[PDB]
Ligand binder design. Sequence first.
Ligand SMILES: *[C@@H]1O[C@H](CO)[C@@H](O)[C@H](O)[C@H]1NC(C)=O
Ligand SMILES: *[C@@H]1O[C@H](CO)[C@@H](O)[C@H](O)[C@H]1NC(C)=O
Ligand SMILES: *[C@@H]1O[C@H](CO)[C@@H](O)[C@H](O)[C@H]1NC(C)=O
Ligand SMILES: *[C@@H]1O[C@H](CO)[C@@H](O)[C@H](O)[C@H]1NC(C)=O
Ligand SMILES: *[C@@H]1O[C@H](CO)[C@@H](O)[C@H](O)[C@H]1NC(C)=O
Ligand SMILES: *[C@@H]1O[C@H](CO)[C@@H](O)[C@H](O)[C@H]1NC(C)=O
Ligand SMILES: *[C@@H]1O[C@H](CO)[C@@H](O)[C@H](O)[C@H]1NC(C)=O
Ligand SMILES: *[C@@H]1O[C@H](CO)[C@@H](O)[C@H](O)[C@H]1NC(C)=O
Ligand SMILES: *[C@@H]1O[C@H](CO)[C@@H](O)[C@H](O)[C@H]1NC(C)=O
Ligand SMILES: *[C@@H]1O[C@H](CO)[C@@H](O)[C@H](O)[C@H]1NC(C)=O
Ligand SMILES: *[C@@H]1O[C@H](CO)[C@@H](O)[C@H](O)[C@H]1NC(C)=O
Lengths: 98, 49, 99, 412, 45, 67
Amino acid sequence: NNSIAIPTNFTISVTTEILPVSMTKTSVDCTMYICGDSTECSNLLLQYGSFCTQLNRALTGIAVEQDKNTQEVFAQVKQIYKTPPIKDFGGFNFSQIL
Amino acid sequence: LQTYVTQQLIRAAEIRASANLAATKMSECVLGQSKRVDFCGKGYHLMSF
Amino acid sequence: NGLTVLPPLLTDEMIAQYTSALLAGTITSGWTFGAGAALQIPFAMQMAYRFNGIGVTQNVLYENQKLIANQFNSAIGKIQDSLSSTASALGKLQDVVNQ
Amino acid sequence: NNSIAIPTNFTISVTTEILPVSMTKTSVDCTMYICGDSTECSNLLLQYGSFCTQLNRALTGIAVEQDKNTQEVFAQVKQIYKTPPIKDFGGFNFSQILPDPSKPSKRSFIEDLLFNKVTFNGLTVLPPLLTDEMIAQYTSALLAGTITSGWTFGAGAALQIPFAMQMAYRFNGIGVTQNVLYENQKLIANQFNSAIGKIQDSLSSTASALGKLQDVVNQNAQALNTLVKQLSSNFGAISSVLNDILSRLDPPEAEVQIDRLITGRLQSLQTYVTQQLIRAAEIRASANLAATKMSECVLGQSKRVDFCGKGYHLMSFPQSAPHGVVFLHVTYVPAQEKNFTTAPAICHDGKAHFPREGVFVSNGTHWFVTQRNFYEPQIITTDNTFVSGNCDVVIGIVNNTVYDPLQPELDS
Amino acid sequence: FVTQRNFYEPQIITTDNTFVSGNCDVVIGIVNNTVYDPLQPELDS
Amino acid sequence: VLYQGVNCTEVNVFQTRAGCLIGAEHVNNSYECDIPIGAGICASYQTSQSIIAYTMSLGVENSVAYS
Ligand SMILES: *[C@@H]1O[C@H](CO)[C@@H](O)[C@H](O)[C@H]1NC(C)=O
Ligand SMILES: *[C@@H]1O[C@H](CO)[C@@H](O)[C@H](O)[C@H]1NC(C)=O
Ligand SMILES: *[C@@H]1O[C@H](CO)[C@@H](O)[C@H](O)[C@H]1NC(C)=O
Ligand SMILES: *[C@@H]1O[C@H](CO)[C@@H](O)[C@H](O)[C@H]1NC(C)=O
Ligand SMILES: *[C@@H]1O[C@H](CO)[C@@H](O)[C@H](O)[C@H]1NC(C)=O
Ligand SMILES: *[C@@H]1O[C@H](CO)[C@@H](O)[C@H](O)[C@H]1NC(C)=O
Ligand SMILES: *[C@@H]1O[C@H](CO)[C@@H](O)[C@H](O)[C@H]1NC(C)=O
Ligand SMILES: *[C@@H]1O[C@H](CO)[C@@H](O)[C@H](O)[C@H]1NC(C)=O
Ligand SMILES: *[C@@H]1O[C@H](CO)[C@@H](O)[C@H](O)[C@H]1NC(C)=O
Ligand SMILES: *[C@@H]1O[C@H](CO)[C@@H](O)[C@H](O)[C@H]1NC(C)=O
Ligand SMILES: *[C@@H]1O[C@H](CO)[C@@H](O)[C@H](O)[C@H]1NC(C)=O
């Protein structure tokens, strides 16, 4: 009820954290995966109706979103700021990361 | 093909959650200074690159 | 087999331009480029403001600046050596390719 | 290493952020969809078991979740707060976003712009639990609490406070000393009133601004139109129509044709329900984000840089919209900087002085301390600063002479 | 009086509870009132 | 019983915006959402007893004493 510990010193620490942002943009022609070349089979696939369009639409929605994710993460900056030619950063060295 | 596209919709929704988290860390940890404990690695947060 | 991979809209060079811009803003201008134009501020003062943001008084930076610079430079050195030494750190990205 | 740019002026800004909150609640009679109530197909569909029942259970989970989302977003307030007869909020407008009495449903003017710009084969649509009129009372309550009582209605009962003092608070929350508001109140009220005025023109200019809400309306119509069009599909059967097959063929042959229509229609219905479960997860992620911005941006003030409109955040106003919510985020943006010489600390007599708050600057001829986010120079003094050790350890310290305001009184 | 904003605790208004910024002309709704000086007891020592 | 999306012509009896509602009693006075129905209607077993249905009250109304 009368003891406290206080730090008399510090460390600056650097902690790496890693996050994924985009899948590989992938798309499939449902007629070319299901049938492939055969006009006979391509005509038979029409009996199943909208699935050919609906599945290529869903992959297009995913594929378009990967460009959106990448802009939502990195394109937060209005201008391309340039690092100055002379590194008077009070001793802090950023060469490895510039 | 329906199985693949269904699983890619769910995986893409998980990557969207990660991309929104990355955009949040970009907004708070780089462009600012977080006062949210252990959102920016262990210790009190100073900045991030 | 009717499968295709499309290119990203931003190339890896364009991502390197944006991470360069975010980083050069963060080094020269603190948080201010997240509101206004990038207001220049000397980097030792930007760290004094960031120390003041964790309840440590500004003088604790300037009275230890040369020590703090060596701790930061050494810490970046350990990141560069760690990432150079082992691929095992990048699991969160390699898993997304593998899946 | 000795240059700092300090903003001498600023702009209040109003940023409109739009979020989806709920889908059109939908439930499908899978027997009326697949079989058209024609009994010979229902007596086959019974043999598939739980694929009848569990799709209504899954869509009921989605339908209830739309009410849960809309409850968590708007019903954060403990009481229905309503604005006094007087509207003297220090000059700040508050009319185009408060309720309009001429509007039948008591929506605001900007809520009416949003409600204008956004636009049964066994399928059924279910009403929301809260009507557009009830949501418009919650967005009025959150707004009337926010205008009359600051963040206090988010902590307990609403405590009244004059609106100029609530803004003086919210400036004091972004590292601007509150005198900067009072000395500029008419200018700040005009920048804010003008910035609201531009929202009405902005929302009038194009429907493409509401893309996030027009998308959740379009995708549910597009899904159901495709689900209806899939009735017109053969899946290998002689005809797309059930009662046609039952007229053409003896029960043995008819059964094989009908079992294809059952399989095809059911696979189309499972595809639709699976897509709606995934779309509902995306809308829930947006509804939790909106429920967070009500708590942090409306009921509070947020330190989270670029969570609550660009610039430093002051406050926000929610406005309702079809299938969603719109925040008018009010933000301080610094806007007219000048370059100044600066030093990390100054020397007095053998002592390093550091600024208590703010930063040292010089116009080139005199040394001053200024607050960090607005140029306002004060003569450097023993109360504005604190000492910490001798005149050496610091890198780039300058020589000066600090005034000590007690010494002229010690002339007594 | 002046108080902390989240609990009623009245402090006598003084030059260390408060800070100056210019004249009254621009401040809408300012009132008058003494501000006490904590040096006064030893200004009259 | 609620007949979702029906007009009572097609079926105490009460027409709601959600549908022709049967066996409940309409009450004008407003209360908490005890059982949800739709389009602002809710139902409860408030007392001498029957199920009632009423337009829900969103909360106690309060004009904040601002000047
Ligand atoms: C504080 O720790 C650092 C190593 O992190 C060391 O170099 C320095 O001498 C220490 N200072 C004190 C006060 O012990
Ligand atoms: C920064 O690091 C690089 C690589 O080790 C080195 O060449 C350079 O001299 C360093 N600069 C400073 C300021 O220490
Ligand atoms: C600051 O900027 C506003 C416009 O945003 C302008 O009207 C005003 O004259 C400027 N200067 C002052 C007096 O702050
Ligand atoms: C807000 O501005 C509008 C501009 O048309 C005006 O009609 C209205 O009276 C103003 N309200 C207040 C109370 O400032
Ligand atoms: C500050 O310095 C830069 C570079 O010399 C110059 O472009 C700018 O006009 C100066 N003034 C401002 C806006 O701070
Ligand atoms: C800034 O760097 C230059 C390098 O030539 C040096 O001469 C100057 O003294 C430095 N000023 C400060 C404030 O450290
Ligand atoms: C300040 O003055 C002292 C002598 O009193 C001198 O030794 C020192 O170098 C001066 N420093 C600067 C920044 O001019
Ligand atoms: C408040 O408004 C009333 C009526 O306009 C006015 O008489 C009074 O002086 C105002 N007080 C302040 C603090 O502005
Ligand atoms: C304060 O007193 C002065 C006269 O010394 C008078 O002109 C002014 O109107 C008074 N202000 C108030 C708000 O009482
Ligand atoms: C229901 O039918 C009646 C028949 O008189 C009609 O007046 C009414 O408008 C219809 N609509 C509803 C849902 O009440
Ligand atoms: C509700 O109000 C109407 C007004 O015409 C009245 O006829 C009806 O009896 C009232 N019902 C109840 C339960 O008070």
